[PDB]
Symmetry: T
Subunit: 66 residues, 12 copies
Amino acid sequence: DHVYKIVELTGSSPNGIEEAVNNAIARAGETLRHLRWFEVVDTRGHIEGGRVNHWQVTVKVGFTLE
Amino acid sequence: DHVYKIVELTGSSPNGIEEAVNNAIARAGETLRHLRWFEVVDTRGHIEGGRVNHWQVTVKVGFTLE
Amino acid sequence: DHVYKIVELTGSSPNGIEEAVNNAIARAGETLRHLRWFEVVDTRGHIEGGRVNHWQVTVKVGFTLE
Amino acid sequence: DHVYKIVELTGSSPNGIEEAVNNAIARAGETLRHLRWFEVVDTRGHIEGGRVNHWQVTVKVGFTLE
Amino acid sequence: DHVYKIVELTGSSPNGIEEAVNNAIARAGETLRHLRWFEVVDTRGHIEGGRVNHWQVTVKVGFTLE
Amino acid sequence: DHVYKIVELTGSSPNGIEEAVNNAIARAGETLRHLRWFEVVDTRGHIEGGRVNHWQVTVKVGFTLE
Amino acid sequence: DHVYKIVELTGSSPNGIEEAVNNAIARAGETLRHLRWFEVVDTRGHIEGGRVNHWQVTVKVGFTLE
Amino acid sequence: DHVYKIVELTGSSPNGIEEAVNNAIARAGETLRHLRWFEVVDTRGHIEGGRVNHWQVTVKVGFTLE
Amino acid sequence: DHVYKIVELTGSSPNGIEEAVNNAIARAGETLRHLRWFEVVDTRGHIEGGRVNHWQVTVKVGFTLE
Amino acid sequence: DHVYKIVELTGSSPNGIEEAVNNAIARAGETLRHLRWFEVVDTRGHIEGGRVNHWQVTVKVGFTLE
Amino acid sequence: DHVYKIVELTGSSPNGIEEAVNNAIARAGETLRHLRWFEVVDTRGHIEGGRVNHWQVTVKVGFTLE
Amino acid sequence: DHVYKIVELTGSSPNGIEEAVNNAIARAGETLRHLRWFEVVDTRGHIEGGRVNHWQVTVKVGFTLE
Ligand SMILES: Cc1cc2nc3c(=O)[nH]c(=O)nc-3n(C[C@H](O)[C@H](O)[C@H](O)CO)c2cc1C
Ligand SMILES: Cc1cc2nc3c(=O)[nH]c(=O)nc-3n(C[C@H](O)[C@H](O)[C@H](O)CO)c2cc1C
Ligand SMILES: Cc1cc2nc3c(=O)[nH]c(=O)nc-3n(C[C@H](O)[C@H](O)[C@H](O)CO)c2cc1C
Ligand SMILES: Cc1cc2nc3c(=O)[nH]c(=O)nc-3n(C[C@H](O)[C@H](O)[C@H](O)CO)c2cc1C
Ligand SMILES: Cc1cc2nc3c(=O)[nH]c(=O)nc-3n(C[C@H](O)[C@H](O)[C@H](O)CO)c2cc1C
Ligand SMILES: Cc1cc2nc3c(=O)[nH]c(=O)nc-3n(C[C@H](O)[C@H](O)[C@H](O)CO)c2cc1C
Ligand SMILES: Cc1cc2nc3c(=O)[nH]c(=O)nc-3n(C[C@H](O)[C@H](O)[C@H](O)CO)c2cc1C
Ligand SMILES: Cc1cc2nc3c(=O)[nH]c(=O)nc-3n(C[C@H](O)[C@H](O)[C@H](O)CO)c2cc1C
Ligand SMILES: Cc1cc2nc3c(=O)[nH]c(=O)nc-3n(C[C@H](O)[C@H](O)[C@H](O)CO)c2cc1C
Ligand SMILES: Cc1cc2nc3c(=O)[nH]c(=O)nc-3n(C[C@H](O)[C@H](O)[C@H](O)CO)c2cc1C
Ligand SMILES: Cc1cc2nc3c(=O)[nH]c(=O)nc-3n(C[C@H](O)[C@H](O)[C@H](O)CO)c2cc1C
Ligand SMILES: Cc1cc2nc3c(=O)[nH]c(=O)nc-3n(C[C@H](O)[C@H](O)[C@H](O)CO)c2cc1C
Ligand SMILES: [Cl-]
Ligand SMILES: [Cl-]
Ligand SMILES: [Cl-]
Ligand SMILES: [Cl-]
Ligand SMILES: [Cl-]
Ligand SMILES: [Cl-]
Ligand SMILES: [Cl-]
Ligand SMILES: [Cl-]
Ligand SMILES: [Cl-]
Ligand SMILES: [Cl-]
Ligand SMILES: [Cl-]
Ligand SMILES: [Cl-]
Ligand SMILES: [Cl-]
Ligand SMILES: [Cl-]
Ligand SMILES: [Cl-]
Ligand SMILES: [Cl-]
Ligand SMILES: [Cl-]
Ligand SMILES: [Cl-]
Ligand SMILES: [Cl-]
Ligand SMILES: [Cl-]
Ligand SMILES: [Cl-]
Ligand SMILES: [Cl-]
Ligand SMILES: [Cl-]
Ligand SMILES: [Cl-]
């Protein structure tokens, strides 16, 4: 039966990890269809002043190809 | 002296990463004894609609065998 | 152009992942200068009673050497 | 001269590993062109009753961009 | 919500890879309950004469703890 | 705030590593927009006679989705 | 044929690496049966004063399930 | 006691994974002696038309040196 | 006898990989002493226009502590 | 609460692994303070004649920053 | 059809990465036959004065056994 | 200048890790020439009764080809 595609995206947020991945999954939902699962590959961030100003979570999203 | 066992559990939460690991550690605490440390091995999730509905954190938990 | 040094630090917090990394980055900012980016290498923790009492996030922080 | 794109797909089959990858490569062949090589990244599966009902092989497929 | 345990088992078979994992999953199903997914970690084997006499596939099996 | 996509490309050159990645980035720039960073994942090549005739560098390219 | 379970243990010793793994295998031998092979995953330790006071070797032990 | 050498071979087959490794092991058995164990390192393949025409399993074979 | 320290630095150059590492090693040579070996951990870069404007090679440098 | 720094050192000894790491930890203890834990990253060595004359164990040492 | 052997060599050069691998492939072509592909495993080097005097690229070369 | 070959051997010993590698390096020195360095890839062992009877250290040995 089924075939899936896995794209790598990195979501950003000034607020934290969960927010960063949700942004990435929201932006994927706009353009792709049948989002099933994801996997966090990596957590990074930008430092401004002496503080984190962007959390950057890169993520693999699995979705059904029809 | 002592010997430790490491078990692999994956906790689930609709709320996020810290809640998902806490759930895993709570469930381990009911059945095992002398939980000492843990390590996150992996963060994954399920997507429903175009949103994350389950954060799935898999974790290794170390505990003393007596 | 520029050369950067990457140091490995692990931040601690009784509250969670983002707080743990912020602590690490705060302490780095006191002593180093020109902090540019970071990467999370590893999330660990201590368990007291049957609950997490310390989140330990180890992180690599990149900063410009002048 | 040539530049290649690598896409990550996961093929499914109730029958086994080879069949799962063939399904993934068939579905890629429908939409893409000049498939040259593949690499198995990962073998997973779903368990129903106490038996495997889906073999899930994830695969990287390299193809020529023209 | 839910919590899963992941155990590592290595199944054996003189016939090949799918049979080896099925054996492992069968033996897990006898003793454990609510087997949900698995992941192949590793494929090894024993060589007798100049031929493979045992396929050894080590696998991670996830199951719901209730 | 922002969201990035990461695509995997492998560039080719009969001259060497830098040229191979530049080709890949050139070809990505024709079709994609807002290329921000890249990472080398892997260096391979084809041998013809007893000499390298193609350097194949596979690379991950990050770019802003708008 | 045979199906094996692999458990992860970490043995401790104030003396060194071999002693640490032997303690882990001894404690496994008390409770499990048909220990066949082991693999070292990791060597760690505790530092007291400015000296190692515990060698911590984590180890995967494979054993036959009957 | 003994000392072993591990050589890396990749076997090929138009039929599948088990056949590919058997070929590699057969060819090793012709030239080497006392083949004891193997480990799969990697599964790759060539695509011709839109179909797999070669399965290429690379494998590490351990054998006793006398 | 001798004990070594390994620091992680990332060198930059608009020209390529070797120049980037040389810059890192030059800047290490100014401040440290007895540089013995290095290892490349990682090759990254910045893209400006549709072209690489900085090669970023991160490197581990080993040097004798006396 | 607390923040730790992890430094990478490689200790040497003509005698063996434990001696090598002890030398590394001794040299760290002279200069740094509040050494808490270590992890072995890697074991290497130099061969002179047809024998090992230096054991080189590289190690990560964690210590409290105050 | 076929069977390949992979050997691991490390080529050296005072000039850089491409030269180092070419040396390794040249020396392999003298003694082996039917060199098909290679893969860079690792880039290291020796530092003399405060400068790189040898680039050491270790490489895996695949060649047809007939 | 120079070119090195890396071979993978696994040394055995009922006594421990250092002895097992020394055996591997001794057996390599009988047949090969100009052994320069080695790296430990892996520590395994056989369990007899409830005790380790063979320590199996696999090692990569680098030697000059002339
Ligand atoms: C090796 C390397 C890694 C970097 N990683 C990141 C990153 O993960 N996130 C980020 O926002 N910027 C990253 N940067 C950009 C960094 O913040 C940069 O030095 C300044 O943004 C421009 O000098 C990286 C730069 C280098 C050289
Ligand atoms: C390779 C692969 C990985 C998957 N990983 C997950 C996961 O991490 N979490 C999850 O809830 N479901 C996972 N699923 C199940 C996925 O959500 C599935 O397609 C639907 O649940 C049923 O089609 C996975 C499926 C595949 C094929
Ligand atoms: C292999 C190993 C790993 C450990 N990792 C951690 C850790 O990540 N964080 C921590 O607070 N303690 C850690 N500990 C210490 C653990 O909590 C310890 O058993 C008690 O603190 C003292 O016995 C570790 C201990 C061992 C043996
Ligand atoms: C960490 C994790 C990994 C999973 N991986 C897979 C998978 O690889 N394939 C799959 O079909 N389902 C997967 N699932 C879904 C699993 O079968 C799930 O529990 C049920 O499908 C719904 O509860 C996964 C779930 C979790 C939590
Ligand atoms: C490093 C090492 C790895 C081994 N791996 C396996 C294995 O994966 N499967 C197996 O049946 N035997 C394995 N053996 C045992 C091997 O077959 C052994 O030499 C004979 O069984 C007894 O000498 C291994 C032995 C060593 C030293
Ligand atoms: C395991 C494997 C890996 C290969 N890798 C490459 C590669 O990285 N680049 C390439 O041009 N060809 C590669 N080839 C193709 C190789 O050059 C092939 O043997 C001839 O091109 C056709 O026989 C590979 C073949 C195999 C079996
Ligand atoms: C990231 C991390 C890793 C640690 N790993 C270990 C370990 O491997 N062994 C150990 O005995 N203690 C470990 N500890 C505990 C460490 O010794 C701790 O700081 C003191 O024991 C209590 O502060 C670890 C602590 C942290 C934060
Ligand atoms: C990065 C890369 C990896 C490759 N891997 C393989 C492989 O695993 N097996 C294979 O038969 N050919 C492989 N090839 C060769 C591929 O099939 C090639 O593009 C055509 O054979 C000649 O253009 C590879 C080529 C590249 C550039
Ligand atoms: C996950 C991630 C990785 C990045 N890595 C790098 C890098 O390696 N080098 C770099 O110069 N900039 C890097 N950047 C910064 C990137 O160029 C950035 O999007 C722009 O510099 C500012 O938006 C990175 C950014 C992200 C989100
Ligand atoms: C890829 C590579 C790795 C090396 N690793 C080591 C090492 O781990 N320890 C060491 O003492 N020397 C090492 N050497 C140096 C080696 O012993 C060298 O050939 C002689 O010391 C000088 O020719 C290495 C050399 C190369 C080319
Ligand atoms: C952990 C370690 C790694 C080393 N790696 C290398 C290497 O990659 N190349 C090299 O030429 N020498 C290497 N050396 C040798 C290093 O240059 C050595 O300190 C001097 O050559 C003799 O003291 C290494 C030494 C150690 C201890
Ligand atoms: C996955 C696997 C790994 C093994 N690894 C080893 C090993 O590292 N050393 C060894 O002596 N035997 C090893 N064996 C052989 C093991 O000891 C075996 O069960 C008995 O020797 C014959 O049943 C392995 C067997 C399996 C299935
Ligand atoms: Cl990917
Ligand atoms: Cl950003
Ligand atoms: Cl996945
Ligand atoms: Cl595990
Ligand atoms: Cl769930
Ligand atoms: Cl641990
Ligand atoms: Cl802490
Ligand atoms: Cl980085
Ligand atoms: Cl499926
Ligand atoms: Cl590839
Ligand atoms: Cl378990
Ligand atoms: Cl999983
Ligand atoms: Cl090409
Ligand atoms: Cl990245
Ligand atoms: Cl302890
Ligand atoms: Cl194993
Ligand atoms: Cl830069
Ligand atoms: Cl090193
Ligand atoms: Cl590091
Ligand atoms: Cl030394
Ligand atoms: Cl650690
Ligand atoms: Cl190898
Ligand atoms: Cl050299
Ligand atoms: Cl090496």
